[PDB]
Amino acid sequence: IKTVDYYSMDGVGKAEWIADRASDIPVVGLAMEKATTTVHLAGIGYDYGLEE
Amino acid sequence: IKTVDYYSMDGVGKAEWIADRASDIPVVGLAMEKATTTVHLAGIGYDYGLEE
């Protein structure tokens, strides 16, 4: 595999005082999020001669 | 015997990052060693006369 991914999420909003007959009410909102990290390859071996 | 011998060994190597269709893989190696001590002689005795 070449990558690994993970998610996170958050939301926001506010509260306010409202009058009896009016229309000014606040709303909320959402969001999501993704993040990444990677994976690499390495190695180590050996060797020898014939009369060794 | 007048000497006593003992042995020791060690080795080295290193790992590295490679690619895909390449050939760069690193090798390892070894070595040995010897040490010595000595042995010596001592004595004690006694003597006595005849009529003693």
For B5-44, give the DSSP string. EEEEEEEE---EE--SS-------EEEEEEEEEE------
Under 8 Å CB-to-CB from A38, ≥6 apart: which residues?
A2, A3, A4
Question: Strands B29-38 and B3-12, how do they pair?
Answer: antiparallel
- Is A41's CB within 8 Å of B15's CB? no
Exposure letters A31-43 (e unless 16+ CB within 10 A, then b): eeeeeeeeeeeee
CA distance B14 to chain A (A): 7
- Say how far apart CA A34 and CA A36 lie, in whole Å: 7
Residue A39 near residue A2 (C-beta atoms within 8 A): yes
**In Å, what resolution does this model reach?**
3.2
Residues forming beta bridges with residue A14, ordered by sequence position: none
A47 contacts in chain B (CB < 8 Å): 27
Phi, psi of A12 (to 5 degrees): -135, 170
